[PDB]
């Protein structure tokens, strides 16, 4: 069946904005997962999971009689697809169960793990999402084996179709670097936003870089990919050594025995894959990765044996029965149990990537400290495991259930509790009138509030106007935020706030986070008034102001807009066309194509462009909220040509006279080009559309303002 994608392989793909519709969702449109989960008897689930750990099923027998290792790996992989660059991946939408992740080579035999959990899923039904269950199971595994976890938050709602995520351009699973679609360039620089070394891996190749078993060089990849997953050196050592305290790898025989991944398997496989022809195909004969390593003498019990072994022995290179590189302790005693035969024991073994923890000089110092103080190791691993598995859950307000940790962590971008009465409608109207009487312009108010709100991304639910972090490092200095204009606006707002708060009785006051938003609302209302329309922009109070001390500046770097088509901003020159970046941004903002279209056309005429650029400002009444962008964009009286100076900027001239009327960017003109966006533009560009445009603008504006307001959910 030949498709639009086959005929026009570089056209824009808008379907990414329209996933997750009510059509694909089996739950009623009123279904509220948070309220279902809040009534789940979580202790009862955890008792069932505890039982599970040691109830071996013959179709996938439990190593050492205990599924703990397998489930820890399953949870780790669920969380481990996470990239800080865009917030995509991670455990928070249960995407391990869909394509492609369910069939990634690094996820081999995690299909068995997920299937082991069906009876418990089935028992508790909609009160526990798969997403939450995968993470909970990991926790229970650790707990069953003697490890005290830091806590657990429910709240990850299930999703019903695969996400659209750029995982790389390679066309071959696990392709080595330096191919026609290499994710590496220069001096082993991994392309953003990727966070793994090969297509279908979680982070790194366990044999070493492109299969070279050099622990020192492997450590370089570990550090890079873990950093791209938001983990520093301490966290990375804790997580790796923590996880490889348990279980084993599977490599009983040659890898050519293993069949098709789940999405390529036959229908009879019922969603399972990697069927193995090697001996029994499971248990003692299992092949997953091809490595054959068991790290510890008690693979079902928390211990400090990983570091005891790592440091206690000297290691020699060897080959698994599948031929993969791995390490064995030279002439150790055979002290490591066999997973199925109680009369066999084995020597200590390690992956090349495990040895990285000892032979990378930075890791070695941390690893030694963990070896000599295994309580520090346990506390670090607990914290890191919580961070791993919760990193894409968003604000602490989404955390559910009785095991949520009380401690507030820096990585959570915490927002202080509000302890005082909030402003009401009359107060909001008085502030709005003050903001407008200060002489702040429509353009300044809208740009500031846009800049504050639009850092939100739905992928990991980081960002947004809550916190007033726009006033702090690093946001206040991002080029897209126009630091000098921003500083002037914030100064005037802060004076209005101080005066307002000083006049109150009874503890009422307004946060600057709220006022920035409210001022943006005044701006949009004044714009509408300039166009002759009386509208009220909805506003919900209750944002609070975070301090610089509660704001990790390095972690905030990834939220910087380098492309914001909504402000006609591109920080530099990229290989990805600007219109593609626009749609990506709209996806992170959770906008549909209609919402993206309305919003952009309104922002243009409000003066939200960075640097007061006239590109796409197709109106002779700037700062009035009108549909002029659309009417003028669609006017066939104008002819567009790319400029000689820049192929990415266009001049619009009167077709009859040649007179220069406007200039625009690819982001502006895509709305007159792409056949689906033009259809949208046409609706807003019609003579009956003025009222619709304003109402839809205000709605989407409001929506953007509220993206991070999970305190109100």
Ligand X SMILES: NNC(=O)c1ccncc1
Query: Interface residues for Cl ion in 165-204 (CB under 5 A)?
Result: 165
Choosing among Cl ion, ligand X, Na ion, none, which partner's interface includes residue 590 (Cβ < 5 to 8 Å by kind)? ligand X
Q: Measured from the CB of residue 59, what is the shortest distance to ligand HEM in angstroms?
A: 15
Choosing among its own copies, ligand HEM, ligand X, none, which partner's interface includes residue 25 (Cβ < 5 to 8 Å by kind)? its own copies
Q: With respect to ligand X, which residue has the nearer C-beta, 163 or 413?
A: 163
Which helix (H) or strand (E) segment holds residue 660: the answer is strand 660-665
Figure out which of the listed residues 246, 478, 684, 710 binds ligand HEM, where binding follows CB under 6 A: 246
Choosing among Cl ion, ligand X, ligand HEM, none, which partner's interface includes residue 222 (Cβ < 5 to 8 Å by kind)? ligand HEM
Figure out which of the listed residues 87, 200, 213, 242 binds ligand HEM, where binding follows CB under 6 A: 242
Q: Which position has the token pair 């309220």?
A: 35
Query: Interface with Na ion by CB under 5 A: which range of 128-136, 282-290, 333-341, 389-397?
Result: 389-397
Choosing among Cl ion, its own copies, ligand HEM, none, which partner's interface includes residue 163 (Cβ < 5 to 8 Å by kind)? Cl ion
Q: With respect to its own copies, which residue has the nearer C-beta, 482 or 663?
A: 663
Phi and psi, residue 237, nearest 5°:
-60, -45
Q: With respect to its own copies, which residue has the nearer C-beta, 275 or 347?
A: 275
449 SS3 class: helix
Query: Rule CB under 6 A: is residue 674 a binding residue for ligand X?
Result: no
Phi-psi region of 327 (alpha: psi -120 to 50; beta: other; left: phi over 0): beta
The two most distant CA atoms of the chain are separated, in Å, by 94
Size of the site for ligand X (CB under 6 A): 8
Figure out which of the listed residues 392, 413, 514, 696 binds Na ion, where binding follows CB under 5 A: 392
Q: Which of these, 477, 666, 452, 696, lies nearest to 580 by C-alpha position?
A: 666
For residues 433 and 559, the answer to whether their CB atoms sit within 8 Å is: no
Q: Which position has the token pair 């997403």?
A: 131
Tell me the CA distances in angstroms from 483 to 470, 473, 474, 475, 476, one per residue in order. Answer: 10, 11, 10, 9, 6
Q: With respect to ligand X, which residue has the nearer C-beta, 276 or 459?
A: 459
- Burial label for 491, CB within 10 Å (0-12, 13-18, 19+), is exposed
Q: What length does the chain have? A: 713
Q: Measured from the CB of residue 203, what is the shortest distance to Na ion in angstroms?
A: 16
Tell me the CA distances in angstroms from 578 to 17, 481, 603, one per residue in order. Answer: 16, 19, 17
For residues 168 and 183, the answer to whether their CB atoms sit within 8 Å is: yes
Query: Rule CB under 6 A: is residue 580 a binding residue for ligand X?
Result: no
Q: What is the DSSP letter of 60?
A: B
**Residue 244 annotated as part of some ligand binding site:** yes
Convert residues 570-609 into a mask of x (bound to its own copies by CB under 8 A) and - (unbound): ---------x------------xxx--x------------
Tokens standing for residue 151: 């806590």
Q: What is the DSSP string of 291-311?
A: ---B--S-TTS--SHHHHHHH
Tokens standing for residue 154: 């429910």
Query: Rule CB under 8 A: is residue 11 a binding residue for its own copies?
Result: yes
Estimate the crossing angle of helix 361-372 against helix 305-312, to 10 degrees. 130
Figure out which of the listed residues 165, 470, 578, 634 binds ligand X, where binding follows CB under 6 A: 165
Q: Measured from the CB of residue 690, what is the shortest distance to its own copies in angstroms?
A: 10
Q: Measured from the CB of residue 492, what is the shortest distance to its own copies in angstroms?
A: 37
Convert residues 82-121 into a mask of x (bound to ligand X by CB under 6 A) and - (unbound): ------x---------------------------------
Q: How far apart are CA 710 and CA 375, in angstroms?
A: 36
Query: Rule CB under 8 A: is residue 123 a binding residue for its own copies?
Result: yes
User: Of 18, 20, 66, 77, which is the active-site residue?
Assistant: 77
Task: Tell me whether residue 77 is one of the annotated catalytic residues.
Answer: yes
Query: Rule CB under 5 A: is residue 88 a binding residue for Cl ion?
Result: yes
Phi and psi, residue 475, nearest 5°:
-55, -35
Tell me the CA distances in angstroms from 605 to 88, 626, 684, one per residue in order. Answer: 32, 7, 14
Figure out which of the listed residues 86, 158, 163, 545 binds Cl ion, where binding follows CB under 5 A: 163
586 SS3 class: helix
Known binding residues for heme b are 244
Q: Which residues are catalytic?
A: 77
Give the binding site for ligand HEM (CB under 6 A). 63, 69-70, 72-73, 76, 203-204, 206, 222, 239-240, 242-244, 246-250, 288-289, 291, 351, 353
Give the binding site for ligand X (CB under 6 A). 88, 163, 165, 458-459, 587-588, 590
Known binding residues are 244
């Amino acid at each position: 069946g030949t498709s639009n994608r086959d005929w026009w392989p570089n056209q824009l793909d808008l379907s990414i904005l329209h996933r997750h519709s009510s059509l694909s969702d089996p739950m009623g449109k009123d279904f509220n997962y948070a309220q279902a989960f809040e009534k789940l008897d979580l202790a009862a689930v955890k008792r069932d999971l505890h039982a599970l750990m040691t109830t071996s099923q013959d179709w996938w027998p439990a190593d050492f009689g205990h599924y703990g290792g397998l489930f820890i790996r399953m949870a780790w992989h669920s969380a481990g697809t996470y990239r800080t660059a865009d917030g995509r991946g991670g455990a928070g939408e249960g995407q391990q169960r869909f394509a492609p992740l369910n069939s990634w080579p690094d996820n081999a035999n995690l299909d068995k793990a997920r299937r082991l959990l069906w009876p418990i899923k089935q028992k508790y039904g909609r009160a526990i999402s798969w997403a939450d269950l995968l993470i909970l199971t990991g926790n229970v595994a650790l707990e069953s084996m003697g490890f005290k976890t830091f806590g657990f938050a429910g709240g990850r709602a299930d999703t019903w179709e695969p996400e659209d995520v750029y995982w790389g351009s390679e066309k071959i699973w696990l392709e080595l670097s330096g191919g026609p679609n290499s994710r590496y360039s220069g001096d082993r620089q991994l392309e953003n936003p990727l966070a793994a070394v090969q297509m279908g891996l979680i982070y790194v190749n366990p044999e070493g870089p492109d299969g070279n078993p050099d622990p020192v060089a492997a450590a370089r990849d570990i550090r890079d990919t873990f950093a791209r997953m938001a983990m520093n050196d301490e966290e990375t050592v804790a997580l790796i050594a923590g996880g490889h305290t348990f279980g084993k790898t599977h490599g009983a025989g040659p890898a050519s025995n293993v069949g098709a991944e789940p999405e390529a398997a036959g229908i009879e496989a019922q969603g399972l894959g990697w069927k193995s022809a090697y001996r029994t195909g499971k248990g003692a004969d299992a092949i997953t990765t091809g490595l054959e390593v068991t790290w510890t003498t008690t693979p079902t019990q928390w211990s400090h044996n990983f570091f005891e072994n790592l440091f206690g022995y000297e290691w020699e290179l060897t080959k698994s029965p599948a031929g993969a590189h791995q390490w064995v302790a030279k002439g150790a005693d055979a002290v490591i149990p066999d997973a199925f035969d109680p009369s066999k024991k084995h020597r200590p073994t390690m992956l090349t990537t495990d040895l990285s923890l000892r032979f990378d000089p930075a890791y070695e110092k941390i690893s030694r400290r963990f070896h000599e103080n295994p309580e520090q190791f346990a506390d670090a691993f607990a914290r890191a495991w919580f961070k791993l598995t919760h990193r894409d859950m968003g604000p602490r307000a989404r955390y559910l259930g009785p095991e949520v940790p009380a401690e507030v962590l820096l990585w959570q971008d915490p927002i202080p509790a509000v302890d005082h009465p909030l402003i009401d409608a009359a107060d909001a109207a008085e502030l709005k009138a003050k903001v407008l009487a200060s002489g702040l312009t429509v353009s300044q108010l809208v740009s500031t509030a846009w800049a504050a709100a639009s850092t939100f991304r739905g992928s990991d639910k980081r960002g947004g106007a809550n916190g007033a972090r726009i006033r702090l490092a690093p946001q206040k200095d991002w080029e897209a935020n126009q630091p000098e204009q921003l500083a002037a606006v914030l100064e005037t707002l802060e004076a209005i706030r101080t005066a307002f708060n000083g006049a109150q009785r009874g503890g009422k006051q307004v946060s600057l986070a709220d006022l920035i938003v409210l001022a943006g609302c005044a701006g949009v209302e004044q714009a509408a008034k300039n166009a002759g329309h009386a509208v009220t922009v909805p506003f919900a109070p209750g944002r609070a102001d975070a301090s610089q001390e509660q704001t990790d500046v390095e972690s905030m770097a990834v939220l910087e807009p380098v492309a914001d088509g909504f402000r006609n901003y591109l920080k530099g020159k990229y290989r990805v066309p600007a219109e593609v970046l626009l749609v990506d941004k709209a996806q992170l903002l959770t906008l549909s194509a209609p919402e993206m279209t309305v919003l952009l056309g309104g922002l243009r005429v409000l003066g939200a462009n960075v640097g007061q650029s006239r590109h796409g400002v197709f109106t002779a009444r700037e700062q009035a909220l009108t549909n002029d962008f659309f009417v003028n964009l669609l006017d066939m009286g104008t002819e567009w040509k790319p400029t000689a100076a820049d192929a990415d900027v266009f001049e619009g001239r009167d077709r009859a006279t040649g007179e220069l009327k406007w200039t625009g960017t690819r982001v502006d003109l895509v709305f007159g080009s792409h056949s689906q966006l033009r259809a949208l533009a046409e609706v807003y560009g019609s003579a009956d559309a003025q009222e619709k445009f304003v109402r839809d603008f205000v709605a989407v504006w409001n929506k953007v303002m509220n993206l991070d307001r999970f305190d109100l959910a």
